[PDB]
Amino acid sequence: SVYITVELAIAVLAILGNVLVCWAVWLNSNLQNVTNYFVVSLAAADILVGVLAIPFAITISTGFCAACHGCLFIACFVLVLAQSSIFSLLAIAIDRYIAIAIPLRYNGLVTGTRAAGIIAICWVLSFAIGLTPMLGWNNCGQPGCGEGQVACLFEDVVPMNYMVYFNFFACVLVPLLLMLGVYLRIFAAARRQLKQMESQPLPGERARSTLQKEVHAAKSAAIIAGLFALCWLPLHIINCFTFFCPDCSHAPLWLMYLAIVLAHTNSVVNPFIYAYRIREFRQTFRKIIRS
Numbered sequence: 001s002v003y004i005t006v007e008l009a010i011a012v013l014a015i016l017g018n019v020l021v022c023w024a025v026w027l028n029s030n031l032q033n034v035t036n037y038f039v040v041s042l043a044a045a046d047i048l049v050g051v052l053a054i055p056f057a058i059t060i061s062t063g064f065c066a067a068c069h070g071c072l073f074i075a076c077f078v079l080v081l082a083q084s085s086i087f088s089l090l091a092i093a094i095d096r097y098i099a100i101a102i103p104l105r106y107n108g109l110v111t112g113t114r115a116a117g118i119i120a121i122c123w124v125l126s127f128a129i130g131l132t133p134m135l136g137w138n139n140c141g142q143p144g145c146g147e148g149q150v151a152c153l154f155e156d157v158v159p160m161n162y163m164v165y166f167n168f169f170a171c172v173l174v175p176l177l178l179m180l181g182v183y184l185r186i187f188a189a190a191r192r193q194l195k196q197m198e199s200q201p202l203p204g205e206r207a208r209s210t211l212q213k214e215v216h217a218a219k220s221a222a223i224i225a226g227l228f229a230l231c232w233l234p235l236h237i238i239n240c241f242t243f244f245c246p247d248c249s250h251a252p253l254w255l256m257y258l259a260i261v262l263a264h265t266n267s268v269v270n271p272f273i274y275a276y277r278i279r280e281f282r283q284t285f286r287k288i289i290r291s
């Protein structure tokens, strides 16, 4: 009951943390910028983790008996939260790029309305993708619980060709490669901005301070994304060995859970990364707790 204990420990933090973030934003209007609209999507997504995803993960670990629709939803619900985080992290990257790249058109393009729109779309696409195995791409009953109910086991009910080709490479590796490519242009151009301002006949510390603060935000965003890939790659890398290399000793269970726990931990690092990186956030939380 140790794995269970740790999974519950995370669920608590994942909730308290991200919920604290959403509350801090709804309280302090200085954090209600268009940018943080996506951060809210990240929070809500990472909240349902300690709310449903973890509970489901703890249940499916031992396996149970249920229909295909019910057994798939429970097993593929984590793919939805993990996929939504992809769109949110990708949007934030693009956003932090638009600001530094074209500061003027930033307010003209990056609107509070389009934000809510994109988010909605992202979630829809998250359910479409995350629950693709429920569209027919599954191994329900492929060569106990009785007729009608199927032994709900993640590896047995969920195809490997999906989580590898479709899910991992396309819906994870590609995005992360796009995001990484974005931050490449972000910091590459950001340092050029400082070089042009390094050869200016005027102080203009307003533009420098602002530029440095926009870079501080883009950097903080880069750290949030990095921890995502750092906490999900291991779990996918394991599935790459199992699939592509049937000979390669199938990953043990003790190692399997560690990769799974590492993914559920990702939802917790965010609340703490804001309180540290952003001096505006930490002062917001500090107040809520006291009062």
Ligand SMILES: Cn1c(=O)c2c(ncn2C)n(C)c1=O
Pocket (backbone or CB within 6 Å): 057, 078, 154, 155, 235, 239, 256, 260
């Ligand atoms: C992504 N993933 C897995 O790849 C997995 C798993 N249990 C077993 N495997 C293989 N769980 C709960 C999971 O979330």
